[PDB]
């Protein structure tokens, strides 16, 4: 379109254009405003003026320097590009900040640039093309791009000072954006850590009366909790145990002292405390974490020892529950065996089992009520909670079915007994030597064996149908037990005499036996191939995570008795006023480093 | 050959010769010339199993005046997100006898499996697979339905007579269809199938099962007493081929 | 012997084989059925102007490369 000739002109000599633009304008000056509608499909002339990128100063004598002279509509607050153009939602300030042109930012802010201008349209490109979620704010964009001078000028700006506590549409602040853009790479982690520390220090200097890290977004999360939930570990670890020595000492979470010779004692601040002041870091890691890195964040330093202490404080309850469950199982087994003064004992046993079953069912329902559909986070580690529910439901249903005197009582009671007996294996959470292998072998079995029984059953059914179809001239389709006898050791492989096609039957049996031996050999070799010698420390972490889940569940208390929350390691005292956790360790290299 | 020194030597010589040919004769496409076998240097590198020179040719880029002699164009777009465009002369069956077909079929070297994860090819194949999973599952479902019908007919074989006849004729059509499909596949790929057989052994099992089914079905019409063993063998082979 | 074959070299030498099998399968399928010759797909056309040739576009977020330049 030739009509867009006014959009781009020879910069440096805007004599006739400016003379014809300001005032006069033949009929009326409103045409000038229309020039901003016809400049492009959503992009103004200022955007191209910034995008020229000439040597040194980009636009020499920028037209804006005189445009504000003939301004009736606020032009420095450019309408951000709309629709979908792969650059929509960007203002002049955003473009100037991107090209690392401090001079352009200065000229724009001098003419009254609108700070805190959220990128209206950028969230379209967030899902359409290049996402690069940076925070939708000029300050966030400057901080995430590692431009210290631009951030410094924007914050302590005499004309329009940017607010460090400003928030975007999602509720994120600059720290939240820095946490979100972080990924587990050696360079980005260092960049985000440096930017986080610098911004925190500058915020303390400029505004020492505001807690930047205590601001929460719409989801109800802080930068620490957000880092824990999103799976970022490097920034999470740095935030968890950062310490400052100079005047910025209060902005620290770990305080270290030498006490008595070469024994170092360190105090960690506790905002990642347990269920107390709920919706904390431990609960977020344990439950609300889709990332597969959740098992690696429970062995950092404060969390590991805190969970160890909590487990050491609650092993007695775990063993008491185990003993009670064992007693209930023994009583149920005795009642099931003795079931045909004795009649009264049998009735007492039956009613006691009914109460136990309804109690277990109600407990499982309460647990599933506490944890909502969010349980879709994972199921590889919480499959016993549905087995317990199934066993309790079967027991209750059988017990209530007994009162109608139906003849199906015995099968359901026996199924409940066997399921309850099988569910006892869950209590191997303790006994570390067993658990380290048990958790990983459970993961391997659940991942692998589920794709064996299907194909083996399909082949068994096919072979059984073939045999029964051939032998009709093994009498029914249900007579497929012969193949199971073959795979367990029996089978009676012999000539069938009266069947004329005995050779075909023998060939089919040979094919089936070689096929099933080959399949089981394949499974064996695959299960061995899983052992890549990577579970040396990747399996201990899983056991620690299981222990953390167990202690979180136990310390919540029973449904019929809400246990009072423990005050944990209070140690209020005076930190240079905040609750702290104290840990001592004997270190010689660190002690010998100093003199 | 795949050695640290020879690869560097050949890459340097290739680039220098290409640049000098562009300078002296900028109106001729040197890399588009084909030999007697009907191959270009890229296709020849793909077929012979050379990977280092193949990889270098696939994603080479020039910055100076020799920019047109490049296959990868890189730009930064919007901040720290890099977007790159790869030229496509290794396209799929379109303009057939291309790099993908040569790698997949005509490659004796054991290095053929290492040239499908380079950079353009990996994502191109991923996109193609994501575009054709529906057809794969539809074929799987159709085969499962056919197997179930054949199993039911085999079991119920001694209004019922009409149903049995319909089942038998439907199985005959299915068997001849599978046989004709396998014959068409083996006609498309000539004796060149002697390249390898460790990865294409199901194509002969399907042919064997279809042949057995067709032979048993045609043998039934002569009322021979060997119908049942052949039908059962076809059933078990078809059930095993589901893997 | 079957155990001795597991020399822990199939960490990436087996994924490549699976990718090759998928490539063979997609090549076979996209050719179409014998009784219905499927029209060839125009793939990632993106003709445009490269500095005129069909191109395939890929995006990736890189920080080390971006931080290398200023």
Author numbering:
A (entry chain C): 76 to 415, 429 to 561, 591 to 693, 701 to 719
B (entry chain D): 258 to 415, 429 to 513
C (entry chain D): 643 to 693, 701 to 719
Task: Reproduce text from the manuscript describing this model.
TRPV2 is a ligand-operated temperature sensor with poorly defined pharmacology.
Although the binding for probenecid remains elusive, C16 associates within the vanilloid pocket. Indeed, the density is also compatible with an alternative C16 pose in the binding site. Consistent with C16 binding, residues H521 and Y525 that line the C16 pocket rotate considerably between TRPV2apo-1 and our two structures to provide space for the compound. The putative C16 binding is at a different position than that proposed for CBD in TRPV2CBD, which however is a closed structure and retains a lipid in the vanilloid pocket. Finally, an important observation from the comparisons of the structures determined is that C16 affects TRPV2 beyond the local binding pocket, and thereby significantly increasing the pore width along the conduction pathway (and see below).
